[PDB]
Design an enzyme around this catalytic site. Structure first.
Site, PDB file in Angstrom:
ATOM      1  CG  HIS A 134       9.632  17.990  87.277  1.00 24.80           C
ATOM      2  ND1 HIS A 134      10.386  18.888  88.003  1.00 24.80           N
ATOM      3  CD2 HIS A 134       9.748  18.361  85.977  1.00 24.80           C
ATOM      4  CE1 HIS A 134      10.941  19.759  87.177  1.00 24.80           C
ATOM      5  NE2 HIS A 134      10.574  19.458  85.943  1.00 24.80           N
ATOM      6  CG  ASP A 172      15.432  19.440  82.942  1.00 29.34           C
ATOM      7  OD1 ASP A 172      14.897  20.455  83.470  1.00 29.34           O
ATOM      8  OD2 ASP A 172      14.892  18.771  82.026  1.00 29.34           O
ATOM      9  CG  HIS A 174      12.381  23.014  84.790  1.00 29.75           C
ATOM     10  ND1 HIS A 174      12.425  22.664  83.454  1.00 29.75           N
ATOM     11  CD2 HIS A 174      11.631  24.139  84.857  1.00 29.75           C
ATOM     12  CE1 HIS A 174      11.726  23.538  82.749  1.00 29.75           C
ATOM     13  NE2 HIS A 174      11.232  24.441  83.578  1.00 29.75           N
ATOM     14  CG  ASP A 265      14.847  21.898  80.174  1.00 31.11           C
ATOM     15  OD1 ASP A 265      15.997  21.629  80.593  1.00 31.11           O
ATOM     16  OD2 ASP A 265      13.806  21.565  80.786  1.00 31.11           O
ATOM     17  CE1 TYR A 305       9.632  19.751  77.151  1.00 31.84           C
ATOM     18  CE2 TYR A 305      11.057  21.384  78.187  1.00 31.84           C
ATOM     19  CZ  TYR A 305      10.273  20.248  78.267  1.00 31.84           C
ATOM     20  OH  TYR A 305      10.126  19.572  79.448  1.00 31.84           O
TER      21      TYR A 305
END
Ligand SMILES: O=C(NO)c1ccc(CC(=O)N(CCO)c2ccccc2)cc1
Ligand SMILES: [K+]
Ligand SMILES: [K+]
Ligand SMILES: [Zn+2]
Length: 358
Positions: A134, A172, A174, A265, A305
Site C-alpha cells: 500500500h 493479498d 487488498h 489475509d 492476521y
C-alpha cells in the site's frame, strides 16, 4: 541450483502499536510463521539468507526524498509526536523502531533477490514486516511504509539490466495501490493483483483497483486487476483466475523473475479478509508460479492476521518451493456467478493486449 533460500530476522518484531498491543499487524505474525517452519522441518531444509538494512539510495529507487526523510525522522520522536505523525496517514501506526524494521524488510528482500539472480539459490521466502504494497512513492498507507516488492523489482533490475522482466503477483486480499502506481507506465514490470473490491467500497477504497485500469502509455496492458465483488471467495475462484488469466498472461510476458506479494489475509480464519482460501489453495498457486522464470520465485510476506492461518499457509508455500508434491485440492465447486463476471470483465479488458487470452 535446487536450493530454497529463507530470510528472517527477529529485529523486525520491534515495530509495534504503542496504544494497542492487540493490533492485528502484530509483531508475533513473523515469529509464529518462523516457528512453524522450524516445527515442520522446513527451515532446516533451506539455505539461510542474511537479513540487512536497505540504504537510503536504495529506497530512492521508488520513493521521494521527502517521504524517506519524514519516516526516518520518526526514529527520534517522542510518543505523542509519533501518534500525531501516524494520524497524518491513512491507517498507520509508528514507533521509534518502525523505520529500522521497514529498512530490514526491504534489505532482507534485496539479499534474497540477489541470491536468486546470481544463482546461489533457485527460489526464496521472505518472512518480513511491516508490509509494503500500500506504500506509495510519496506516502505511507495501510500498515506499509516503503513498498518492499516495488523496491525489490527495481533493485533486481539494478544488479542485472534495466530491462529485466519482473512479474509481481499480488494475492493479498487488498489491492496493492502503491505497486500499481509505481509501475503503471512501466512495461518491464508486469503487475497482477487479485483483490476484494466490492465496487470500490473495500480498503483501500479506490476505483484504481478496478479491471479497467490496464496501465498507461507504454505500460498499457502491463497492469492486471482482478477485482472480486459479492462476498466470500475461495479456492475455486482463485484457481479459475490463475487458469484463465494469471498464468496465460504470465507465460506470454515470459518473466525472468517472479515476486509474490504474499499476503495471507484472503485465508480462511482471517477477519480482515472474509475469504476462504485454504493452505492447500496457496500451495497450488505457488506451484503454478514455479513453472515461470526458470523457477526464479521470491515469496514476500504482506498482510494476513490470523496467526495460525498465516503460519500454515506460508509454510505450505515454502514446502512447494522446496519441491514437495502439491497436496490434494478438494472438489472445486462451480464458481460464484459474481466471480465469473469478474473474470470475464478482466478477459474483455485485456484481450487487446494479450493475444493468448481466449
Ligand atoms: O495491509 C492490510 N491487510 O493486509 C490492511 C491495510 C489497512 C487496513 C485498514 C482497514 O481496512 N480498516 C477498515 C476495516 O473495516 C480500518 C480499521 C480501523 C481503523 C482504520 C481503518 C486493514 C488491512
Ligand atoms: K492483491
Ligand atoms: K506495469
Ligand atoms: Zn491486505
Amino acid at each position: 541450483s535446487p536450493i530454497t533460500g529463507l530470510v528472517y530476522d527477529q529485529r523486525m518484531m520491534l515495530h509495534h502499536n504503542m496504544w494497542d498491543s492487540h493490533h492485528p499487524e502484530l509483531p508475533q505474525r513473523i515469529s509464529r510463521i518462523f516457528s512453524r517452519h522450524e516445527e515442520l522441518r522446513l527451515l532446516s531444509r533451506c539455505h539461510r539468507i542474511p537479513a540487512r538494512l536497505a540504504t537510503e539510495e536504495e529506497l530512492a529507487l521508488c520513493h521521494s526524498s521527502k517521504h524517506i526523510s519524514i519516516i526516518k525522522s520518526s526514529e527520534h520522536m517522542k510518543p505523542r509526536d509519533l501518534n500525531r505523525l501516524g494520524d497524518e496517514y491513512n491507517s498507520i501506526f509508528i514507533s521509534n523502531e518502525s523505520y529500522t524494521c521497514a529498512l530490514l524488510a526491504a534489505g532482507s528482500c534485496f539479499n534474497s533477490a540477489q541470491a536468486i539472480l546470481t544463482g546461489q539459490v533457485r527460489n526464496a521466502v521472505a518472512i518480513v514486516r511491516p508490509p509494503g504494497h500500500h506504500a506509495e512513492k510519496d506516502t505511507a498507507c495501510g500498515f506499509c511504509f516503503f513498498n518492499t516488492a516495488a523496491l525489490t523489482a527495481r533493485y533486481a533490475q539494478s544488479i542485472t539490466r534495466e530491462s529485466l522482466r519482473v512479474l509481481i503477483v499480488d494475492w493479498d486480499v487488498h489491492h496493492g495501490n502503491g505497486t500499481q502506481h509505481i509501475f503503471e507506465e512501466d512495461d518491464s514490470v508486469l503487475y497482477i493483483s487479485l483483490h476484494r473490491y466490492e465496487d470500490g467500497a473495500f480498503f483501500p477504497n479506490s476505483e484504481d483497483a478496478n479491471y479497467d485500469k490496464v496501465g498507461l502509455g507504454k505500460g498499457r496492458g502491463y497492469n492486471v486487476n482482478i477485482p472480486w465483488n459479492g462476498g466470500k471467495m475461495g479456492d475455486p475462484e482463485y484457481m479459475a483466475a490463475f487458469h484463465h488469466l494469471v498464468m496465460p498472461i504470465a507465460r506470454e510476458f515470459a518473466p525472468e523473475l517472479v515476486l509474490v506479494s504474499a499476503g495471507f489475509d484472503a485465508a480462511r480464519g482471517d477477519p480482515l479478509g472474509g475469504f476462504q482460501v485454504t493452505p492447500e489453495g496457496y500451495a497450488h498457486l505457488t506451484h503454478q508460479l514455479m513453472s515461470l522464470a526458470a523457477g526464479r520465485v521470491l515469496i514476500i510476506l504482506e498482510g494476513g492476521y490470523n496467526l495460525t492461518s498465516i503460519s500454515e499457509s506460508m509454510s505450505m508455500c515454502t514446502s512447494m518451493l522446496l519441491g514437495d508434491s502439491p497436496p490434494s485440492l478438494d472438489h472445486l465447486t462451480p464458481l460464484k456467478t459474481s466471480a465469473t463476471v469478474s473474470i470475464n470483465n478482466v478477459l474483455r479488458a485485456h484481450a487487446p493486449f494479450w493475444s493468448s487470452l481466449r
